[PDB]
RNA sequence: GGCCGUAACUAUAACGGUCCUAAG
RNA sequence: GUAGUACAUUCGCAAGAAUGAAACUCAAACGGAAUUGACGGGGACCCGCACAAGUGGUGGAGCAUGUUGCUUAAUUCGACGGUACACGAAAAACCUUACCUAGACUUGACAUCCUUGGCAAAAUUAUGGAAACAUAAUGGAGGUUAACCGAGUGACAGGUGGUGCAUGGUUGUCGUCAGCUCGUGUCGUGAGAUGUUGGGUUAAGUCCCGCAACGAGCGCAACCCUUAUCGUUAGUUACAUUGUCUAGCGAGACUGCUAAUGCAAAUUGGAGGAAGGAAGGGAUGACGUCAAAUCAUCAUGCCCCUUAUGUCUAGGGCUGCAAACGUGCUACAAUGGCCAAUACAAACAGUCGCCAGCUUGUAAAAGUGAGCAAAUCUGUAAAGUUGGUCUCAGUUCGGAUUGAGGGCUGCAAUUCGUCCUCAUGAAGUCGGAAUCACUAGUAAUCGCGAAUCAGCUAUGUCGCGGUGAAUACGUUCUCG
RNA sequence: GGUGUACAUAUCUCCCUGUCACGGAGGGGU
RNA sequence: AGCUCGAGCAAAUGACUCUUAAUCAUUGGG
RNA sequence: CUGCUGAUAAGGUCUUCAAAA
């Protein structure tokens, strides 16, 4: 995102900001209840986002 | 007020006649960054030289550039009114560069058909010391000879 | 000339974000970005006597968690937990009754070397008609005695009610602003004086961060215990 | 006139094309970021304060 | 020797333009 | 200052010499010496696309946009050398909108404090209506009033109204230039000086020697991101011509080794190395100057309006037009115009969206309709290569302007949207005095994407890749 | 010719400069 | 017209600037 | 190595204070 610094004029002087959506993939073959119950107690931190697809 | 001398990039030998001047004149006739188009122009002109002069195109090209190639340069130096000129001996590299630049500039102005034939006929005319680049070299040489007196004072 | 914000230059490298959430859509991103601003502005403009150094906000799909670091949390607590319910209801009205609130007060250790509360004290002294030279001198000497590195205080505006604006700066100790490794805390406050507005900007240097990482660690809350509740 | 315009913007109009996006913190009408619902001059302040998660300065 | 314009009350023109003569 | 003036006197042929006031006027003086800056058409040294060597433009024509001026009911306001003019505005048909005309309102469209009840506000259907708003309807989520829906009620709300020369915040500029200061000490009656100047070396007040100075702070540099080689981790939605590619960690480059000369910093050359001596690019911008810009992002002192400078709505306007300037696009053409086939990207974006395929249409597009919440599906790459044709002409260049028929968005396209087709075919054949940008993947040139956005002659802005140059001898001149 | 006799001056536009004058390019008026 | 012959000055109103001067427009005034 | 090179309306801020911590 590119934003002009100044309040009124001088469009030439403008700064920039970035936001990165880092992405990882991990596929489990067979889990079973023995692993699902343990997975229930993980408590992933808020910044991380899960997109479980079953 | 720079006190640094610029570096020099490689000239690269031509991959057809193995003559660097061919690559130099390709880069000189470059426009819009079209290497393919410039190379086509040069090679078509050289083939027309084959068709006309019945001699080696590289030899004809060298005979043209050596004849067009100047000796003296007049540098403008103003003091009070107008400019009094100064004749100075040029390096060989700038000599060749000026020869090629004049050749291209006077080739892209002749009255003829496609630039292929334009530059080809300009080269064949300059091979015999009768052309427009020849006139340019003659003019600068005569001007330097006239202003030979102020050659001692340069700056 | 103009200098980039000291906090903004260091954010995302050696400083974590004050609000940590991931919204669903662009419509919700604006609502969540405004509600947190309202909550923080509430905690700062009112209940000011508690020296609230900083408030962080942490939200999920539906749950709001607030971490309020304060120097004197007794004023937030009130008499036998009275004002606590008032501020809880204020926050619930701000965000919504449909969500679950997890407000958590935290006593901040070694408060003196925190630019927010230093600037707030500066602004209060300015508004209370206290002489500026004495005010800045006492604030600087107490900040230095707290055991930190250099502190730079810039106080600009209609100084002492004069008709021509001036500015007065006091740097005492090394304050490397171009260095990114330095732990520099910057705060800015407005003293609303009878003659207008005075802008106080406090930079404080708190050593060098020699451990690579996006913080994930407390920043001058750890020297004493930092354990206060009101949570679940 | 700013409070009335802000209130009118919140209020739904009688035509769909009548609706425009104003900043939610301030009331600026032009140069509004629909990704964040915040004008440029308030987006800069929020980014410098750390309010918007993940918005760090870019070096490219 | 002429002609024309020109100064923050008016008035005038220190000043500027131009034609001619051997010189005005 | 009057003024070496005037009168009187003496001398002199004469110019004049000697002597020499006052009236009036000012608070100082073309006063003295010394200090810090600024300046010099004064010297010495050093830098920058500054000059020089090249490339491509601008000023000439048409068009887009902004500005000055004028006109109008309004053409809202601001920005005015460098540091304003494709700027605020990353989207003016309605809204935006702050302007004009007109129809309506008054503790008000919005809010708090108080005495007080909640058994509503919406939305939509009727009639009057340009719409505001009125009279009637379903009388409504809910939770007993929580929020909000009210009555009473005066403090008041409200102001894009003035003052950026009362301010906070933010920003332009000198300038990413290398400067700006402080503590202690010493010199001087004092302003002040020293350190910061001197010699080497750098981009650098960078560092090393010298030195009545010894140190320190901000600035410089490094730490941060990215590109260039490699190792390891992982192999789906990448690869699957098997090790590309993507993204975490790490190695690597440190004047580290060597030769020269210097006291030392250090400078130059060589080796190996993907990379060599700030490896390329970005973020990062000291004290202060211009009372520089913004009260129209926001906040705010003071002044001003309070049945109006406050509020709602409809229409018009910000798009005018004898003119002038700035910034851009398109051209004046065979290094080209048109037609056909065809190869090679990166980055980004996408569920009121990206839209594959198919059918219809000369085409903009319409209908059907899968796929994709995305390394999976979609967003046609163009210059380039080959072939055909034009054969140097105001033309098969150039597209302005103009008439007609259609497409899409939208309540609504006349003022004032853009696209397609058909038809017409202005100027313009390289642009005067004078000026601009640029030192390698740079200039030039060709496409692609995104932001604001229902739609938009954005040709603008921010990004990505393809092809890809010429020149730098030197500081005599020119600006800083 | 607006002023002195097509010319000069004068007038307008653009360069030049921080700005003006000077200077340079172009246009019009009996 | 206040003055010199509807014109130009004078006066006023605004624009302009920190405020004026100058400038720009408008303008009543026989 | 000596061309040419002229001018810039008036009045003005800006130091409040060390008594002291
Ligand atoms: Mg407002
Ligand atoms: Mg809209
Ligand atoms: Mg005497
Ligand atoms: Mg005198
Ligand atoms: Mg100077
Ligand atoms: Mg000079
Ligand atoms: Mg040049
Ligand atoms: Mg062009
Ligand atoms: Mg033009
Ligand atoms: Mg204004
Ligand atoms: Mg305007
Ligand atoms: Mg202004
Ligand atoms: Mg409108
Ligand atoms: Mg009910
Ligand atoms: Mg009740
Ligand atoms: Mg200012
Ligand atoms: Mg110095
Ligand atoms: Mg000395
Ligand atoms: Mg020294
Ligand atoms: Mg740096
Ligand atoms: Mg000003
Ligand atoms: Mg400016
Ligand atoms: Mg106001
Ligand atoms: Mg309207
Ligand atoms: Mg406009
Ligand atoms: Mg062809
Ligand atoms: Mg596939
Ligand atoms: Mg297709
Ligand atoms: Mg071809
Ligand atoms: Mg013609
Ligand atoms: Mg054509
Ligand atoms: Mg139309
Ligand atoms: Mg032609
Ligand atoms: Mg450079
Ligand atoms: Mg003013
Ligand atoms: Mg001259
Ligand atoms: Mg004069
Ligand atoms: Zn805003």
Curated annotation (Swiss-Prot), chain A:
One of its GO terms (biological process) is translation. One of its GO terms (cellular component) is ribosome. Keywords: Ribonucleoprotein, Ribosomal protein. The keyword Ribonucleoprotein applies. Transmembrane segments: none annotated. Signal peptide: none annotated. Disulfide bonds: none annotated. It comes from the Bacteria. The keyword Cell division does not apply. GO terms for molecular function: structural constituent of ribosome; tRNA binding. Belongs to the universal ribosomal protein uS10 family. Part of the 30S ribosomal subunit. Involved in the binding of tRNA to the ribosomes. This is Small ribosomal subunit protein uS10. It comes from Mycoplasma pneumoniae (strain ATCC 29342 / M129 / Subtype 1) (Mycoplasmoides pneumoniae). The chain holds residues 55 to 108 of 108 of the full protein.
Curated annotation (Swiss-Prot), chain B:
The keyword Phosphoprotein does not apply. InterPro entries: Ribosomal_uS7, Ribosomal_uS7_bac/org-type, Ribosomal_uS7_CS, Ribosomal_uS7_dom, Ribosomal_uS7_dom_sf. GO terms for biological process: translation. The keyword RNA-binding applies. Pfam families: Ribosomal_S7. One of its GO terms (molecular function) is tRNA binding. Keywords: Ribonucleoprotein, Ribosomal protein, RNA-binding, rRNA-binding, tRNA-binding. GO terms for cellular component: small ribosomal subunit. Part of the 30S ribosomal subunit. Contacts proteins S9 and S11. Belongs to the universal ribosomal protein uS7 family. One of the primary rRNA binding proteins, it binds directly to 16S rRNA where it nucleates assembly of the head domain of the 30S subunit. Is located at the subunit interface close to the decoding center, probably blocks exit of the E-site tRNA. This is Small ribosomal subunit protein uS7.
UniProtKB/Swiss-Prot annotation, chain C:
One of its GO terms (biological process) is translation. It comes from the Bacteria. One of its GO terms (cellular component) is cytosolic small ribosomal subunit. Residues 39-109 form the KH type-2 domain. Transmembrane segments: none annotated. One of its GO terms (molecular function) is rRNA binding. Keywords: Ribonucleoprotein, Ribosomal protein, RNA-binding, rRNA-binding. Binds the lower part of the 30S subunit head. Binds mRNA in the 70S ribosome, positioning it for translation. Belongs to the universal ribosomal protein uS3 family. Part of the 30S ribosomal subunit. Forms a tight complex with proteins S10 and S14. This is Small ribosomal subunit protein uS3. The gene is rpsC.
UniProtKB/Swiss-Prot annotation, chain D:
Pfam families: Ribosomal_S14. Its cofactor is Zn(2+). PROSITE patterns: RIBOSOMAL_S14. The keyword Translocase does not apply. The keyword Glycosyltransferase does not apply. Keywords: Metal-binding, Ribonucleoprotein, Ribosomal protein, RNA-binding, rRNA-binding, Zinc. GO terms for cellular component: cytoplasm; small ribosomal subunit. GO terms for biological process: translation. GO terms for molecular function: rRNA binding; structural constituent of ribosome; zinc ion binding. InterPro entries: Ribosomal_uS14 (IPR001209), Ribosomal_uS14_bact (IPR023053), Ribosomal_uS14_CS (IPR018271), Ribosomal_uS14_sf (IPR043140). Gene3D superfamilies: 30s Ribosomal Protein S14, Chain N. It comes from the Bacteria. Zn(2+) binds at residues 23, 26, 39, 42. Binds 1 zinc ion per subunit. Belongs to the universal ribosomal protein uS14 family. Zinc-binding uS14 subfamily. Binds 16S rRNA, required for the assembly of 30S particles and may also be responsible for determining the conformation of the 16S rRNA at the A site. Part of the 30S ribosomal subunit. Contacts proteins S3 and S10. This is Small ribosomal subunit protein uS14. The gene is rpsZ.
